[PDB]
Design an enzyme around this catalytic site. Structure first.
Site, PDB file in Angstrom:
ATOM      1  N   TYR A  18      46.399  50.335  44.432  1.00 50.20           N
ATOM      2  CA  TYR A  18      47.515  51.055  45.060  1.00 50.20           C
ATOM      3  C   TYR A  18      47.264  51.370  46.552  1.00 50.20           C
ATOM      4  O   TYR A  18      47.590  52.457  47.020  1.00 50.20           O
ATOM      5  CB  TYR A  18      47.817  52.345  44.257  1.00 50.20           C
ATOM      6  CG  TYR A  18      47.859  52.063  42.772  1.00 50.20           C
ATOM      7  CD1 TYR A  18      48.871  51.270  42.227  1.00 50.20           C
ATOM      8  CD2 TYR A  18      46.855  52.538  41.916  1.00 50.20           C
ATOM      9  CE1 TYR A  18      48.897  50.970  40.872  1.00 50.20           C
ATOM     10  CE2 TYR A  18      46.871  52.240  40.553  1.00 50.20           C
ATOM     11  CZ  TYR A  18      47.902  51.464  40.038  1.00 50.20           C
ATOM     12  OH  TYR A  18      47.930  51.161  38.696  1.00 50.20           O
ATOM     13  N   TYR A 150      55.674  54.791  32.594  1.00 50.77           N
ATOM     14  CA  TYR A 150      54.802  53.817  33.252  1.00 50.77           C
ATOM     15  C   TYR A 150      54.076  53.022  32.188  1.00 50.77           C
ATOM     16  O   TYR A 150      53.576  53.599  31.214  1.00 50.77           O
ATOM     17  CB  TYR A 150      53.760  54.508  34.143  1.00 50.77           C
ATOM     18  CG  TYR A 150      52.772  53.547  34.794  1.00 50.77           C
ATOM     19  CD1 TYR A 150      53.145  52.744  35.875  1.00 50.77           C
ATOM     20  CD2 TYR A 150      51.462  53.463  34.332  1.00 50.77           C
ATOM     21  CE1 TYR A 150      52.229  51.864  36.462  1.00 50.77           C
ATOM     22  CE2 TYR A 150      50.547  52.592  34.915  1.00 50.77           C
ATOM     23  CZ  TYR A 150      50.942  51.805  35.973  1.00 50.77           C
ATOM     24  OH  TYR A 150      50.010  50.964  36.507  1.00 50.77           O
ATOM     25  N   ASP A 247      53.428  52.941  23.412  1.00 46.23           N
ATOM     26  CA  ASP A 247      52.358  52.554  24.291  1.00 46.23           C
ATOM     27  C   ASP A 247      51.366  53.706  24.313  1.00 46.23           C
ATOM     28  O   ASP A 247      51.628  54.733  24.923  1.00 46.23           O
ATOM     29  CB  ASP A 247      52.921  52.297  25.682  1.00 46.23           C
ATOM     30  CG  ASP A 247      51.863  51.885  26.656  1.00 46.23           C
ATOM     31  OD1 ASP A 247      50.666  52.070  26.349  1.00 46.23           O
ATOM     32  OD2 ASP A 247      52.237  51.387  27.738  1.00 46.23           O
ATOM     33  N   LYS A 276      42.036  51.513  27.316  1.00 45.14           N
ATOM     34  CA  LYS A 276      41.298  52.603  27.973  1.00 45.14           C
ATOM     35  C   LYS A 276      40.149  53.176  27.149  1.00 45.14           C
ATOM     36  O   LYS A 276      39.080  52.583  27.103  1.00 45.14           O
ATOM     37  CB  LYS A 276      42.247  53.698  28.467  1.00 45.14           C
ATOM     38  CG  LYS A 276      43.092  53.275  29.672  1.00 45.14           C
ATOM     39  CD  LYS A 276      43.888  54.456  30.196  1.00 45.14           C
ATOM     40  CE  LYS A 276      44.766  54.029  31.359  1.00 45.14           C
ATOM     41  NZ  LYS A 276      43.988  54.055  32.647  1.00 45.14           N
TER      42      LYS A 276
HETATM   43  C1  LIG Z   1      50.769  54.101  29.278  1.00 42.15           C
HETATM   44  C2  LIG Z   1      50.130  53.046  29.977  1.00 42.15           C
HETATM   45  N1  LIG Z   1      50.436  51.773  29.672  1.00 42.15           N
HETATM   46  C3  LIG Z   1      49.833  50.680  30.324  1.00 42.15           C
HETATM   47  C4  LIG Z   1      48.896  50.881  31.319  1.00 42.15           C
HETATM   48  C5  LIG Z   1      48.360  49.738  31.977  1.00 42.15           C
HETATM   49  O1  LIG Z   1      46.947  49.560  31.803  1.00 42.15           O
HETATM   50  P1  LIG Z   1      46.176  48.734  32.989  1.00 42.15           P
HETATM   51  O2  LIG Z   1      46.506  49.403  34.439  1.00 42.15           O
HETATM   52  O3  LIG Z   1      46.533  47.199  32.961  1.00 42.15           O
HETATM   53  O4  LIG Z   1      44.662  48.927  32.727  1.00 42.15           O
HETATM   54  C6  LIG Z   1      48.571  52.196  31.687  1.00 42.15           C
HETATM   55  C7  LIG Z   1      47.620  52.335  32.695  1.00 42.15           C
HETATM   56  N2  LIG Z   1      47.538  53.654  33.297  1.00 42.15           N
HETATM   57  N3  LIG Z   1      46.647  53.968  33.972  1.00 42.15           N
HETATM   58  C8  LIG Z   1      46.780  55.169  34.533  1.00 42.15           C
HETATM   59  N4  LIG Z   1      45.978  55.659  35.484  1.00 42.15           N
HETATM   60  C9  LIG Z   1      46.316  56.882  35.947  1.00 42.15           C
HETATM   61  C10 LIG Z   1      45.672  57.583  36.886  1.00 42.15           C
HETATM   62  C11 LIG Z   1      46.131  58.837  37.284  1.00 42.15           C
HETATM   63  C12 LIG Z   1      47.267  59.383  36.686  1.00 42.15           C
HETATM   64  C13 LIG Z   1      47.902  58.615  35.710  1.00 42.15           C
HETATM   65  C14 LIG Z   1      47.428  57.408  35.360  1.00 42.15           C
HETATM   66  S1  LIG Z   1      48.020  56.278  34.186  1.00 42.15           S
HETATM   67  C15 LIG Z   1      49.195  53.268  31.003  1.00 42.15           C
HETATM   68  O5  LIG Z   1      48.907  54.556  31.341  1.00 42.15           O
END
Ligand SMILES: Cc1ncc(COP(=O)(O)O)c(C/N=N/c2nc3ccccc3s2)c1O
Ligand SMILES: Cc1ncc(COP(=O)(O)O)c(C/N=N/c2nc3ccccc3s2)c1O
Lengths: 427, 428
Positions: A18, A150, A247, A276
């Site tokens: 990002y 998301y 999800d 995760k």
């Molecule tokens: C519900 C959900 N579905 C799919 C994904 C995607 O996983 P990847 O980014 O491919 O490892 C994610 C990945 N989210 N990563 C996140 N990182 C942060 C960091 C700070 C605050 C919120 C989040 S969500 C997700 O939360």
């Protein structure tokens, strides 16, 4: 490489998540070790110990360098690093699939491994689309969700991110056009569910699935909703013959106080994504589970097969560490552990409620959130947290933690204190 | 679990690549170990050692359980398994980034790590689209490729797969509609390039990028093409202001007899994807590299940041083993090693040319292919290969190998003999 040389190489050559190249406000901090709940970071040329309050983006549930996970990894390494999953199978995949089927909501009987969360979302969408194609209903190809969501960064995943406020908002012109219900409220309101049903009904013949994050929406704003909404979603999807996909990539493996967030409502989706915390934060792995009906309908359709298969699918090393992580979690009283963490977070964050820049404080299992009245400046928050022995990474207007489950009461205290002082500085 | 219990669990609960559940047919075979160029498999309850002729799908270039790679992984395990790459950086990521920037075609200066080949392809597309948005040209949003290609299984990556096709038809009516040139031929024909140019020209204002596998097309048909076609693509893309992406996920790290396949043509793409052999086949990791111009143009655009960031981005364990794998490759005379492998494949597969069912025999670096006149029956091919101590996996009309770089001449002789036999069994 010295920390100085790392910083130099990183600035010249490395793209961060990002981020822009050459114009990021904050430089990255060099990390040099991780053990238990602690990171060793370099600050002003000196190593410091800080608490990993975020569990390395919600992965490190047992902390770093846990002897059980290190050993599960080294043991597998001695036997078989990797083999292709085409025409071959192996013990780590079988052990993990059996564990995941046994602990996920009832009826999720089949497991498709992939390498990351965004991929497992794409696989869930593919399962849903092939399922209806298998029923001779190829017009059911759209997805429905609620706002504030998301689901990752690949192009189909982006199509169900919140379109006017989500991180992929500028892309909406090139993405698949999906169906969005309003933001799900925190408190249960039957009128919300009725409106969702009325909207879904208008689109039922063109919808493959409803896809949502159950209970906790992460990247979209660390927002919590009443689990009864999931009951309504299950009811609605059943009555209109729309598949339901949960999800659980962020919510899985005890994080919200239930083993999976769906469990708060006793609901089974048709398709589920996990990742995760799956691997204990060692290695990249994700999985997409689906019911026997979904699998058989895909398998008995014109395609005869699910048209997906990643290179390192079901990697023995990643599967092996995940087996150990899940067994480590199941083998302790994890529910009491999370209840204790939640109580610690609640008690420690209570004093933020009276701060002038704080609009909400909320806790859900081992997730703690201070919502502020303005976006939080990382140039202020990062040093302030580090000064207090804690790695915290705010985003938007949120200061939040999702600590390793191994954190002692004293450690939780230290984390909540740093968060409170971050919120105080914002104001 | 015993191998019988593995089979039971597997049959009930595990999805395999491009397969069904409950409709097999033919159970998968249990793999219990891997060491060097050999896999230990369970055949009729008996553990047998067989050659990994396909390097576990291009990945195991140094073989399995190489001491240098095992050690690098365990060394990193003791210090730091993984930290988030958001606001933090670390030695494995820096070391690997510097290596990749140094060994890839000139001008590829910036590295975005991800966790799989399909994701690296999505990242490359996103870079291309965001680049043009940063130039105020958001209409440049489509991709162009040639037929016969494969770039992975996520929905964007599917849109540039061969439609006719690796797995199209069913999907085509839900995928982004990209621009496809005809199949690139084996032999160099300047007329093919002129036609590619003319097709591209009419689409130039809506095209962000040309995306191709350089020299070798893998999953789409194990086809080879003259590297001079890549020189033409570089030129066409320059003149019509379309970015060039090379997907070297299968061709990377010496496989085709050059460190990267682009090097055969002496050309640099604007964006490059690498994976598979990157980690010596231990762990999933991939990378997307781009030029300074691409990175800065994205970074100066009103959008600003590249909105992508996989959870395990730049994972220290995966990066650590990759560093060791790349250094191990670079610290030997890899070029002579591949030349010898190409020599042994050519010599071994020669017998096949005269076989009734065989239409082509072809070798490029450490890749050997027998193409037949009809689909290869796995029920026939598998026992035949296993009897000869080799794991082969034909698909469509193709019998092929991409063996570990560590294979001895004897092992290459064994592999090719198994391939010739499979081809012999096709046409009788
Ligand atoms: C519900 C959900 N579905 C799919 C994904 C995607 O996983 P990847 O980014 O491919 O490892 C994610 C990945 N989210 N990563 C996140 N990182 C942060 C960091 C700070 C605050 C919120 C989040 S969500 C997700 O939360
Ligand atoms: C050029 C290219 N680009 C992208 C991908 C996708 O990588 P992932 O499967 O998402 O890790 C791939 C993945 N390819 N896998 C292959 N497996 C075989 C097996 C036998 C013969 C060819 C192939 S290509 C690729 O080759």
């Amino acid at each position: 490489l010295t920390p100085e040389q790392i910083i130099a190489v990183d600035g010249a050559h490395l793209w961060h998540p990002y981020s822009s190249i050459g114009r990021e406000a904050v430089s990255p901090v060099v990390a040099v070790a991780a053990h238990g709940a602690w990171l060793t970071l370099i600050r002003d040329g000196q190593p410091i110990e800080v608490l990993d309050a975020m569990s390395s983006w919600w992965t490190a549930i047992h902390g770093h360098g846990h002897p059980a996970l290190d050993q599960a990894l080294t043991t597998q390494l001695r036997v078989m690093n990797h083999v292709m999953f085409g025409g071959l199978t192996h013990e780590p995949a079988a052990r993990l699939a059996k564990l995941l089927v046994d602990i996920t909501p009832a009826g999720l009987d089949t497991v498709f491994f992939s390498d990351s969360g965004s991929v497992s979302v794409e696989v869930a969408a593919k399962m849903a689309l092939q399922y209806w194609r298998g029923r001779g209903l190829p017009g059911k190809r759209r997805l429905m969700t609620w706002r504030g969501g998301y689901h990752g960064d690949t192009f189909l995943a982006m199509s169900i991110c919140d379109p006017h406020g989500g991180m992929h908002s500028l892309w909406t012109d090139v993405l698949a056009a999906q169906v969005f219900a309003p933001q799900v409220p925190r408190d249960y309101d039957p009128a919300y569910s009725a409106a969702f049903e009325a909207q879904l009904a208008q689109h039922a013949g063109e919808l493959a699935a409803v896809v949502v994050e159950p209970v906790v929406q992460g990247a979209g704003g660390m927002r919590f909703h009443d689990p009864r909404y999931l009951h309504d979603l299950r009811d609605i999807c059943r009555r209109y013959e729309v598949l339901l996909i949960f999800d659980e990539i962020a919510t899985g493996f005890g994080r919200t106080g239930a083993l999976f967030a769906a469990d708060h409502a006793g609901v089974s989706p048709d398709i589920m994504c996990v990742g995760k915390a799956l691997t204990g934060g060692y290695l990249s792995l994700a999985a997409t589970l689906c019911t026997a009906d979904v699998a058989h309908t895909i398998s008995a359709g014109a395609a005869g097969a699910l048209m997906h298969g990643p290179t390192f699918m079901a990697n023995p090393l990643a599967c092996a560490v995940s087996v150990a992580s899940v067994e480590l979690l199941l083998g302790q009283d994890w529910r009491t552990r999370i209840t204790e963490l939640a109580a610690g977070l609640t008690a420690g964050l209570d004093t933020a409620r009276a701060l002038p820049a704080v609009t909400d404080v909320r806790v859900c299992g081992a997730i703690g959130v201070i919502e502020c009245d303005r976006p939080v400046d990382l140039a202020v928050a990062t040093p302030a947290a580090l000064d207090r022995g804690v790695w915290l990474r705010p985003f938007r207007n949120l200061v939040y933690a999702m600590p390793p489950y191994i954190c002692t009461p004293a450690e939780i205290t230290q984390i909540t204190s740093a968060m409170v002082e971050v919120a105080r500085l914002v104001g």
